[PDB]
Tab-separated table of C-alpha atoms in Angstrom:
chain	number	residue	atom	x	y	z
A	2	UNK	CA	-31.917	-22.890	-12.871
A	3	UNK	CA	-30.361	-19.577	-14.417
A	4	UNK	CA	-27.165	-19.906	-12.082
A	5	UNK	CA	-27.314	-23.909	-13.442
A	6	UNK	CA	-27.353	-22.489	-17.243
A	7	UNK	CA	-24.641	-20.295	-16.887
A	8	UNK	CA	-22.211	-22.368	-15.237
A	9	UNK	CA	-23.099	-25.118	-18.109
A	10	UNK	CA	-22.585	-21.958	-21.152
A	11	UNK	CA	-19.065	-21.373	-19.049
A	12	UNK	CA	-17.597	-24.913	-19.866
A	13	UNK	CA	-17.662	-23.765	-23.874
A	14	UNK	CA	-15.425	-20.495	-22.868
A	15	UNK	CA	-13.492	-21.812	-20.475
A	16	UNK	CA	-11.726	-24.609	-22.823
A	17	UNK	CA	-12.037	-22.246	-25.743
A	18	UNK	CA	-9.178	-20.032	-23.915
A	19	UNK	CA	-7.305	-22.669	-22.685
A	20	UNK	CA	-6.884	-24.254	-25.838
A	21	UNK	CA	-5.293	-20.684	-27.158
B	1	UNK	CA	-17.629	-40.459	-30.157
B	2	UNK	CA	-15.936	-43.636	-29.944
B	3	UNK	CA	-13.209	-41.718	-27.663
B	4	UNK	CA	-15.492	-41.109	-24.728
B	5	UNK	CA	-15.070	-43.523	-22.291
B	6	UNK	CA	-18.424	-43.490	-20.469
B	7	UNK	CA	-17.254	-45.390	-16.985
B	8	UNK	CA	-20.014	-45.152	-14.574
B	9	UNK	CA	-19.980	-42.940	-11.737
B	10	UNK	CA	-20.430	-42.641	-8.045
B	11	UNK	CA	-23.613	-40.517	-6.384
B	12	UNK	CA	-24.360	-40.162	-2.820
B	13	UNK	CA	-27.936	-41.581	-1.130
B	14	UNK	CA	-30.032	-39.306	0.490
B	15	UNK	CA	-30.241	-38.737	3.871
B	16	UNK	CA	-33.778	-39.969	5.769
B	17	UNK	CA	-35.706	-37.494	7.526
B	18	UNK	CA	-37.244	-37.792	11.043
B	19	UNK	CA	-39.613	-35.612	12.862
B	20	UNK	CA	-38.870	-31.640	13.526
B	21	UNK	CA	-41.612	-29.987	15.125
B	22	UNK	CA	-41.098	-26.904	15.298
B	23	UNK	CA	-45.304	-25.093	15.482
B	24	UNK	CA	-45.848	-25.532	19.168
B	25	UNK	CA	-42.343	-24.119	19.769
B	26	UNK	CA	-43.256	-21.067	17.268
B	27	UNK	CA	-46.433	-20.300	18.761
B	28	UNK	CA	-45.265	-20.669	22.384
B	29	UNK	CA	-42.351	-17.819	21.399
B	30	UNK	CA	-44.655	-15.275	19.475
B	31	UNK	CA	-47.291	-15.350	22.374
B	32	UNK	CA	-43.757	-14.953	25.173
B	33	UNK	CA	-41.542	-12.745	23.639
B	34	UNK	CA	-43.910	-10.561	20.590
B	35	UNK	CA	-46.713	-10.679	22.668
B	36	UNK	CA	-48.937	-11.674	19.957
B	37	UNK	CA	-52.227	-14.635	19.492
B	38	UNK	CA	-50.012	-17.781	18.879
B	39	UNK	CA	-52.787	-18.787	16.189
B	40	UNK	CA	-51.785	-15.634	14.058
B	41	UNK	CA	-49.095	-17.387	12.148
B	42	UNK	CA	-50.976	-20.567	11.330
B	43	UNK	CA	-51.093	-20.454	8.048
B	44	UNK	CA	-46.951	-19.308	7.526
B	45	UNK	CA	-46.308	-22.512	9.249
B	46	UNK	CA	-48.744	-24.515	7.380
B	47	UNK	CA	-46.287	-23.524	4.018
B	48	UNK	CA	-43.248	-24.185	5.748
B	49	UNK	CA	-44.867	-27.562	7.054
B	50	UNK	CA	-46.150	-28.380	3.458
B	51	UNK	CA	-42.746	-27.392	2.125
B	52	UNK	CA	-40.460	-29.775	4.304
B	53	UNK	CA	-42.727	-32.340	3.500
B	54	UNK	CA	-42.024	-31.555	0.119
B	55	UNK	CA	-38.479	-31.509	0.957
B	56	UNK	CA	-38.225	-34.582	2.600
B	57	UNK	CA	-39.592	-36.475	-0.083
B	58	UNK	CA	-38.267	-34.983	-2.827
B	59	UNK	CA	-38.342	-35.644	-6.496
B	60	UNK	CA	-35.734	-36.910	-8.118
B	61	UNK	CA	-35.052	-34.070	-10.856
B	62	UNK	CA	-33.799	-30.728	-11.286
B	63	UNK	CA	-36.879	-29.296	-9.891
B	64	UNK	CA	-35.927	-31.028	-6.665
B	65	UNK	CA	-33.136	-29.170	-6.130
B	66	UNK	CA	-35.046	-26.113	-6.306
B	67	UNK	CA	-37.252	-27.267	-3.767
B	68	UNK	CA	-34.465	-28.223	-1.357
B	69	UNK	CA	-32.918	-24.913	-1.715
B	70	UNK	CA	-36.414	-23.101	-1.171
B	71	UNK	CA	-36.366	-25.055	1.889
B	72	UNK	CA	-33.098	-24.180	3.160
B	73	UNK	CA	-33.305	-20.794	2.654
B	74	UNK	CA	-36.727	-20.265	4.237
B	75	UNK	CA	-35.145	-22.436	7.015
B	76	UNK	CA	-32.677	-19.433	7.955
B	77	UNK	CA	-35.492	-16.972	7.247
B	78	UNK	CA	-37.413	-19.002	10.380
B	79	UNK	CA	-33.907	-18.837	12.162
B	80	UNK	CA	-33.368	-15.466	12.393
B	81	UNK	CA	-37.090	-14.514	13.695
B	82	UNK	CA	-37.398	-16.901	16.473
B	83	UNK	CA	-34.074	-18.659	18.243
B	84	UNK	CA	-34.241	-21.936	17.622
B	85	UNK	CA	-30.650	-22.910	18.012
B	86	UNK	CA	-28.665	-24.740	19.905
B	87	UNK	CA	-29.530	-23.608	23.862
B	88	UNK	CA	-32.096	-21.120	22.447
B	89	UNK	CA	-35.398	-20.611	24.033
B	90	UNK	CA	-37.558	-21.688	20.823
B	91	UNK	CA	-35.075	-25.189	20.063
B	92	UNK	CA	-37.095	-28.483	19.511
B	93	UNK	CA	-35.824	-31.922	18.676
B	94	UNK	CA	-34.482	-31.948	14.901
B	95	UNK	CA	-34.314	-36.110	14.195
B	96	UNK	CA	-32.228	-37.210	10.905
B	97	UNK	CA	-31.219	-40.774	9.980
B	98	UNK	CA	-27.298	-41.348	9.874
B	99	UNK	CA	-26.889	-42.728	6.577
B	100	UNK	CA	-24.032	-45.494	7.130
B	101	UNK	CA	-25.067	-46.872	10.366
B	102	UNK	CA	-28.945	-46.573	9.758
B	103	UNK	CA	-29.868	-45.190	13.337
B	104	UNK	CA	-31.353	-41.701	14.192
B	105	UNK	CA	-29.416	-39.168	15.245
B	106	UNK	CA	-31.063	-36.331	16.921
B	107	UNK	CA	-30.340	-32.582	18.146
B	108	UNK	CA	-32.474	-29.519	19.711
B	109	UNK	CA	-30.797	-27.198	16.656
B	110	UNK	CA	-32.489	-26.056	13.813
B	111	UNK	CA	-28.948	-25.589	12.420
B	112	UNK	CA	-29.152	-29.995	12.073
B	113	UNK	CA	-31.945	-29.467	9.824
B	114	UNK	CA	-30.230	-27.145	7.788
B	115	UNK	CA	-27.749	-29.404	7.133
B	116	UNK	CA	-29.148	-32.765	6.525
B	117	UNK	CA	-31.359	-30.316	3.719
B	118	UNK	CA	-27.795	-29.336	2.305
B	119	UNK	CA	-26.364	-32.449	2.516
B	120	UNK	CA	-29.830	-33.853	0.442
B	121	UNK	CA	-28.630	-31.176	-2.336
B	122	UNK	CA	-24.907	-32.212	-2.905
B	123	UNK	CA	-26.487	-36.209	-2.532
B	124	UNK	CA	-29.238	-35.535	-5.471
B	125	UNK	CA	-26.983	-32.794	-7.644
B	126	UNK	CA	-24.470	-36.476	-7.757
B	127	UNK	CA	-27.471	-38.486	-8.506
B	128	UNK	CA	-28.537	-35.897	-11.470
B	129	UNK	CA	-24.890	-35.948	-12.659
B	130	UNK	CA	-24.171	-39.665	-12.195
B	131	UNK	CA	-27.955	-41.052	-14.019
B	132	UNK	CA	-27.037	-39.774	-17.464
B	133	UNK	CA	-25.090	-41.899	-19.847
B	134	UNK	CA	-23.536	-38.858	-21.109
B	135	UNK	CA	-24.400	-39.597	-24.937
B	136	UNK	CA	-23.711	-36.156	-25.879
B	137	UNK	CA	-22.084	-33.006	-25.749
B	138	UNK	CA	-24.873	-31.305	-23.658
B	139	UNK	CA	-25.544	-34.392	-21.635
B	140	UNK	CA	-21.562	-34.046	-20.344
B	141	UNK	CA	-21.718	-30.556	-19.717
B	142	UNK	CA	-24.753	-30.933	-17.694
B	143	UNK	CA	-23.155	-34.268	-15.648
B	144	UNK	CA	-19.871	-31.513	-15.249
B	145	UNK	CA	-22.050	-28.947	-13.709
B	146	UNK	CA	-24.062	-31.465	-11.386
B	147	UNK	CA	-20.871	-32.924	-10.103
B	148	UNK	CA	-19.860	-29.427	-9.169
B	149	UNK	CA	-23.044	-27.949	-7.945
B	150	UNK	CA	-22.601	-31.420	-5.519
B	151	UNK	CA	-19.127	-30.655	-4.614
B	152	UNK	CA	-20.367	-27.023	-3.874
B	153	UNK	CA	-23.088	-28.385	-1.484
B	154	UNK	CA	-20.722	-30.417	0.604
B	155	UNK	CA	-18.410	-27.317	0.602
B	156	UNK	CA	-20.456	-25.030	2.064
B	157	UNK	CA	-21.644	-27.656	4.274
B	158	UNK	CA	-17.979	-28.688	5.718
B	159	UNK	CA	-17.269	-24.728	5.884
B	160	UNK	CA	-20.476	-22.917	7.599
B	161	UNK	CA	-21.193	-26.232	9.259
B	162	UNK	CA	-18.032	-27.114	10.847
B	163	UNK	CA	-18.937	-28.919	13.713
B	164	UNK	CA	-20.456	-32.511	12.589
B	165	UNK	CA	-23.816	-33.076	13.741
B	166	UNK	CA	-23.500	-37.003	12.359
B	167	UNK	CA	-20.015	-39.175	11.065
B	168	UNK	CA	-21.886	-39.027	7.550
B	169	UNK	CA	-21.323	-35.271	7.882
B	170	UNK	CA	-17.425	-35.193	9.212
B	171	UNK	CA	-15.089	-33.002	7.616
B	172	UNK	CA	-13.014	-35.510	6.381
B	173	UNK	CA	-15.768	-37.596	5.007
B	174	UNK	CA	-17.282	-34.019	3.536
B	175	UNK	CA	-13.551	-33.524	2.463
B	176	UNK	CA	-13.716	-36.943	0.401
B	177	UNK	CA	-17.122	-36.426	-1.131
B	178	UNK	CA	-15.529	-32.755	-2.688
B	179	UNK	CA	-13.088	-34.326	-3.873
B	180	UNK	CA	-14.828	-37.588	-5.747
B	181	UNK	CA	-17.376	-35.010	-7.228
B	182	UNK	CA	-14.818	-32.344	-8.410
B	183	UNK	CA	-13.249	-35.425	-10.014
B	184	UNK	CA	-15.884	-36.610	-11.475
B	185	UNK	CA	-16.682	-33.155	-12.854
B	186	UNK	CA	-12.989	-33.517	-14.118
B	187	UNK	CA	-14.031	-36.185	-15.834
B	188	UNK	CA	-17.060	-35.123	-17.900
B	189	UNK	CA	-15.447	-32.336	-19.026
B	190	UNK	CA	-12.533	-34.837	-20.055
B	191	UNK	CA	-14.739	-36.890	-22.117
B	192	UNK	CA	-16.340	-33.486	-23.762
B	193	UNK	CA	-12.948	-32.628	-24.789
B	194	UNK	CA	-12.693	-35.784	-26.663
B	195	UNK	CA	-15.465	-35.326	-28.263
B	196	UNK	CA	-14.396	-31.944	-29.462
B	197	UNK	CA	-10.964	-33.153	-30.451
B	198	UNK	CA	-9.143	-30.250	-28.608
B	199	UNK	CA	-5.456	-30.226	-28.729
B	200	UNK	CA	-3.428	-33.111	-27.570
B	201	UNK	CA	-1.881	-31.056	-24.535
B	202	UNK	CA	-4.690	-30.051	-23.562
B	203	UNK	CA	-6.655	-33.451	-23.221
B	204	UNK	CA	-3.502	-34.386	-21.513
B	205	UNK	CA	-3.456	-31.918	-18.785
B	206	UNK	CA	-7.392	-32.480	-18.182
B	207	UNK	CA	-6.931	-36.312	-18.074
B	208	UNK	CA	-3.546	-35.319	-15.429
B	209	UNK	CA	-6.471	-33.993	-13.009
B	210	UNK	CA	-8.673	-36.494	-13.226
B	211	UNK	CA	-5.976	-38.668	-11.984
B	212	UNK	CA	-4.702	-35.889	-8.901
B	213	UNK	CA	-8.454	-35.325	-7.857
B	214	UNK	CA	-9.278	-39.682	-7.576
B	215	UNK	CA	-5.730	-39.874	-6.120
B	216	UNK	CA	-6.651	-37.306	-2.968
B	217	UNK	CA	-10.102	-39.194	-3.089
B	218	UNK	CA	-8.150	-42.573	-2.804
B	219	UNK	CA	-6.297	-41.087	0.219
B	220	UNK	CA	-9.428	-40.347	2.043
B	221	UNK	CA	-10.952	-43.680	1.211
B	222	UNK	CA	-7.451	-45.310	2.819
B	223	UNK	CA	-8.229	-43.700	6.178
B	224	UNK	CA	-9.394	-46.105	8.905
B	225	UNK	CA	-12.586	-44.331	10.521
B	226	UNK	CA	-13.854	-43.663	7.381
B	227	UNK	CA	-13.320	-47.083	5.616
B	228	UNK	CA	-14.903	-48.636	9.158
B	229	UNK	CA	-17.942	-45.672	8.367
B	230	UNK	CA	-18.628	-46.563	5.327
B	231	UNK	CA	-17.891	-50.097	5.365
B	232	UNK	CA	-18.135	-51.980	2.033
B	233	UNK	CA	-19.222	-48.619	0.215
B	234	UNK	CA	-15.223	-47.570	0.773
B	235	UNK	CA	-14.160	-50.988	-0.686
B	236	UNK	CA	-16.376	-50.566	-3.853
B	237	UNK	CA	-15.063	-46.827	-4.113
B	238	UNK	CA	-11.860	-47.841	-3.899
B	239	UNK	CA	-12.210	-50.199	-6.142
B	240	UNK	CA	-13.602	-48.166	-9.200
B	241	UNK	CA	-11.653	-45.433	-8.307
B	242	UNK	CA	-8.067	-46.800	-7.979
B	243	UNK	CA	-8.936	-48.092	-11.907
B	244	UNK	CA	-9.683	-45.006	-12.543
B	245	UNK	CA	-6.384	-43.639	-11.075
B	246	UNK	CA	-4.938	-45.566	-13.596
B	247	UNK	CA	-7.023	-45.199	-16.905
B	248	UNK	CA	-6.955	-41.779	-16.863
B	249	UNK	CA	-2.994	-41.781	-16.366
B	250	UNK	CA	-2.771	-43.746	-19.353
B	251	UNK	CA	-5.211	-41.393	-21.516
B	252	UNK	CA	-2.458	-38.467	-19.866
B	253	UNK	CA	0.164	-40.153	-21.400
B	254	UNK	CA	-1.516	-41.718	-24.647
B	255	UNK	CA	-2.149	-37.583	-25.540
B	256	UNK	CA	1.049	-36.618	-24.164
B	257	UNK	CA	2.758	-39.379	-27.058
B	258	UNK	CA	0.180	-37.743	-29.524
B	259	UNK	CA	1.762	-34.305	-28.540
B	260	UNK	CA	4.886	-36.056	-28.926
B	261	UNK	CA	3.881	-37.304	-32.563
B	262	UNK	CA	2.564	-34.042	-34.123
B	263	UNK	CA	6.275	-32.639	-33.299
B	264	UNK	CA	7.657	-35.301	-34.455
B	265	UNK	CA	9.254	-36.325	-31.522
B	266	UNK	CA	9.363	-39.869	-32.405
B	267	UNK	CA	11.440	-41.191	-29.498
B	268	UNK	CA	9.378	-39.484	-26.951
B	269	UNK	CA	6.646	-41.075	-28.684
B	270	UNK	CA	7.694	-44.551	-27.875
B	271	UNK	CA	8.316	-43.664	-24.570
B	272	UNK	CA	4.850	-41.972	-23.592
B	273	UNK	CA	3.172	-44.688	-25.213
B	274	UNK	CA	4.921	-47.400	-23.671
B	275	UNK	CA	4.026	-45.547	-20.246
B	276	UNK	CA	0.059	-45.313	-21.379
B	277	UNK	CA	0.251	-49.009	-22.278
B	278	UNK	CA	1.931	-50.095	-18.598
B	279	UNK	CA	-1.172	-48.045	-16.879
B	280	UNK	CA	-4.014	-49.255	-19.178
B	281	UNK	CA	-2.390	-52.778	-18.271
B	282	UNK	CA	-2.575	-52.014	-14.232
B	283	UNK	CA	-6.369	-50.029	-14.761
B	284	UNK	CA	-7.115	-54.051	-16.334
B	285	UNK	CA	-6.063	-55.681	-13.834
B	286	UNK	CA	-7.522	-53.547	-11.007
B	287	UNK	CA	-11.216	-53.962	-13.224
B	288	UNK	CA	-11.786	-57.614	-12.160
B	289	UNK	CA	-15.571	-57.432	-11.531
B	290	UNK	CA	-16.170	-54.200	-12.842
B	291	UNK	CA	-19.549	-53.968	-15.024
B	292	UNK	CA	-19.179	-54.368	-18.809
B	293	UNK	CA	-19.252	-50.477	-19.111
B	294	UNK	CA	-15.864	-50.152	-17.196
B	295	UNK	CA	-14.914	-53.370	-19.115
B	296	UNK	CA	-16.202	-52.221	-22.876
B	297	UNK	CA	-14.051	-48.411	-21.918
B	298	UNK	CA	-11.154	-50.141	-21.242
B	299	UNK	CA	-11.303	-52.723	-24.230
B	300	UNK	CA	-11.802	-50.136	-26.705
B	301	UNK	CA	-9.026	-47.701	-24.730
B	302	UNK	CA	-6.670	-50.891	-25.683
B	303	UNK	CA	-7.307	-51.270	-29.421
B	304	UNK	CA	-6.239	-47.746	-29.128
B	305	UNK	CA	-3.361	-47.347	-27.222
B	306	UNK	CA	-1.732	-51.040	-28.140
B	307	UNK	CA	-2.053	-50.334	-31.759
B	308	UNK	CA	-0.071	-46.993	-31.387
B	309	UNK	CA	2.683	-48.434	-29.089
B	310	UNK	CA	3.128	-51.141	-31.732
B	311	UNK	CA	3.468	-49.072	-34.670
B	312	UNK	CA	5.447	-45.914	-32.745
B	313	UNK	CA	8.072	-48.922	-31.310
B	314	UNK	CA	8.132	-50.165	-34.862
B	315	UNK	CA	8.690	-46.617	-36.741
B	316	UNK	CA	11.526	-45.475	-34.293
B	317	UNK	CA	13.047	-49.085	-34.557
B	318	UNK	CA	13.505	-49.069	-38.541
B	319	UNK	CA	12.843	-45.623	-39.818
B	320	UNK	CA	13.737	-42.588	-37.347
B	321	UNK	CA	16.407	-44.244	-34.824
B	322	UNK	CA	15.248	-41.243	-31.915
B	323	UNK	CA	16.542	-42.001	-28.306
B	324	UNK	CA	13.415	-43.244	-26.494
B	325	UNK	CA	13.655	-41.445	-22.836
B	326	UNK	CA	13.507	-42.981	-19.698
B	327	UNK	CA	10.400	-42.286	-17.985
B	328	UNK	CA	12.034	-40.158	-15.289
B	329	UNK	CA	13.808	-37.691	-17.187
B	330	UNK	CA	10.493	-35.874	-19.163
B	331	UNK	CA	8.516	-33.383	-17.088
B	332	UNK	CA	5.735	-34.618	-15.416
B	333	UNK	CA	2.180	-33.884	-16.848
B	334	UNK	CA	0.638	-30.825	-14.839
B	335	UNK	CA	-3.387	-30.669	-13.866
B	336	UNK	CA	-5.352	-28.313	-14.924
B	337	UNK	CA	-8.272	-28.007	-12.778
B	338	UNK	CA	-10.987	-25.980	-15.249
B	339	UNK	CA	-13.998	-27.559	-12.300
B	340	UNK	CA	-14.481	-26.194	-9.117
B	341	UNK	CA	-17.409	-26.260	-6.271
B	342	UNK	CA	-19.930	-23.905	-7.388
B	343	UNK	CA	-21.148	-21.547	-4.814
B	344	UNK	CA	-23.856	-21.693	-2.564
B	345	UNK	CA	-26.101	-18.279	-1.427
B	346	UNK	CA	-28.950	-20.211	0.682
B	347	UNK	CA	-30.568	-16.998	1.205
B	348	UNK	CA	-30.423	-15.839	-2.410
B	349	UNK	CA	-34.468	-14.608	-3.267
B	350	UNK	CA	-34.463	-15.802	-6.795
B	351	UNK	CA	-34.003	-19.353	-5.291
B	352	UNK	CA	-36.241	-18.732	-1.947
B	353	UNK	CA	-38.744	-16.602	-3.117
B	354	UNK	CA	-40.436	-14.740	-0.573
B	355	UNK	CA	-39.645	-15.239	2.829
B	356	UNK	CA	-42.792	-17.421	4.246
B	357	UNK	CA	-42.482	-15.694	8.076
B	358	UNK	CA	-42.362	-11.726	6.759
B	359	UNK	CA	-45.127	-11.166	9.237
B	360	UNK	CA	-43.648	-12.643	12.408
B	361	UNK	CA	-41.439	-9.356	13.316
């Protein structure tokens, strides 16, 4: 369920630097 | 928001189990081979017998998953103290229902058991994803992640299991079921975009990937053996996911004209709205039958993108006089694929805890 968490708190960052 | 579209998605069943007795074959091998009372371990394989029932019939929640993945791990912990294998000494009938056909399929390998159990995690990860309407932000995010903790099931399953035990286990059928789940990922994390109004481009290229993910999907579904397989489950895939083919094309090209408008490209405009309009119009057409969510997305999608054609047309007609380009002559809208299967460490101890059989050595 930590794995889970992190993978959800990833989606934020990962747009965040493709946006630029 | 009002931008998400919400269209239902697909989830997988879960397979049945059958019998797998595997105490007389554990006792039979510690008395043989480690020269021990077979009664010694009786209470290890009570837990592992009280776990598999567990498995077996397992909840329909996130805390299901954890017990599926206790159980495969503790699975390989039994495999690697006492052979039970295909053509080992300790192998005993492993019995699983094929899901398609209905009718048992069975195997002397604990390796089958271990993979109807993964299987049973990418089917209730798609269930998790596909039961929430996906309301907001968080409820997206976590429908994204189930999709791919699915697609990362059936990927280590078509990888470390690559001989099919059943046809509901085939590569290529394991091949389409990554590919409908990383697309549906693509899709939740589509719709959070929205609702974060990220740049045009952006929501473009996402929506682009959607489309190239349901398109490979669509190609599996098209294959004989596995449209005979699945019977009328590939027609109502096919179905849902050819309109989807075309929806999300449109929403690529209905952002790609919005990228168009903020540089004031106003003949490009016309053009990418034009295109958006022609695929909403095909995604209609191929939605005869679909439920009044698919119906009620696509009906709101329309005041949208007809509205925009109509005034875009209108303002390059009388105002800016831009060339509107032919389709063909604008570069293509490239994916970009920000889901992926996540990966799978069946052994990992924070998910297996202790190994049940630590004794048996």
């Amino acid at each position: 369920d930590s794995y889970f968490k992190a993978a959800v708190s990833d989606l934020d960052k990962l747009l965040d630097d493709f946006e630029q | 928001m009002e931008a998400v579209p919400r269209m239902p998605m697909i989830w997988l069943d879960l397979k049945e189990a059958g019998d797998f007795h595997f105490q007389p074959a554990v006792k039979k091998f510690v008395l043989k081979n480690y020269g021990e009372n077979p009664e010694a371990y009786n209470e290890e394989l009570k837990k592992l017998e009280l776990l598999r029932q567990n498995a077996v019939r397992v909840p329909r929640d996130f805390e299901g998953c954890s017990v599926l993945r206790k159980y495969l791990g503790q699975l390989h912990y039994l495999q690697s103290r006492v052979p039970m294998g295909s053509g080992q000494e300790a192998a005993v009938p492993v019995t699983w229902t094929e899901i398609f056909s209905g009718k048992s399929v069975a195997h002397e390998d604990i390796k089958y058991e271990q993979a109807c159990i993964l299987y049973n995690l990418g089917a209730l990860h798609s269930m998790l994803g596909a039961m929430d309407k996906r309301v907001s932000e968080e409820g997206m995010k976590v429908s994204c992640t189930h999709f791919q903790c699915a697609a990362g099931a059936f990927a280590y399953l078509r990888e470390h299991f690559p001989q099919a035990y059943s046809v509901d286990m085939s590569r290529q059928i394991l091949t389409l079921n990554v590919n409908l789940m990383l697309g549906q990922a693509q899709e939740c994390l589509l719709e959070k975009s929205m609702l974060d109004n990220r740049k045009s481009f952006l929501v473009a290229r996402i929506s682009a990937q959607v489309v190239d993910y349901y398109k490979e999907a669509c190609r599996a579904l098209e294959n004989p053996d596995t449209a005979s397989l699945l019977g009328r489950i590939q027609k109502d895939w096919k179905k849902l996911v050819q309109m989807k083919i075309y929806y999300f094309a449109a929403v690529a090209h209905l952002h790609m004209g919005k990228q168009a408008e903020e540089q004031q490209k106003f003949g490009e405009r016309v053009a990418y709205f034009q295109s958006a309009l022609d695929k909403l119009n095909e995604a209609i057409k191929l939605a005869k039958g679909q439920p009044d969510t698919v119906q009620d997305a696509l009906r709101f999608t329309m005041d949208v993108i007809g509205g925009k054609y109509n005034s875009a047309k209108k303002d390059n007609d009388f105002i800016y006089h831009e060339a509107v380009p032919a389709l063909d002559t604008l570069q293509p809208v490239k994916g970009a694929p920000l889901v992926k299967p996540l990966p799978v460490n069946p052994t990992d101890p924070a998910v297996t805890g202790p190994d049940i059989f630590a004794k048996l050595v």
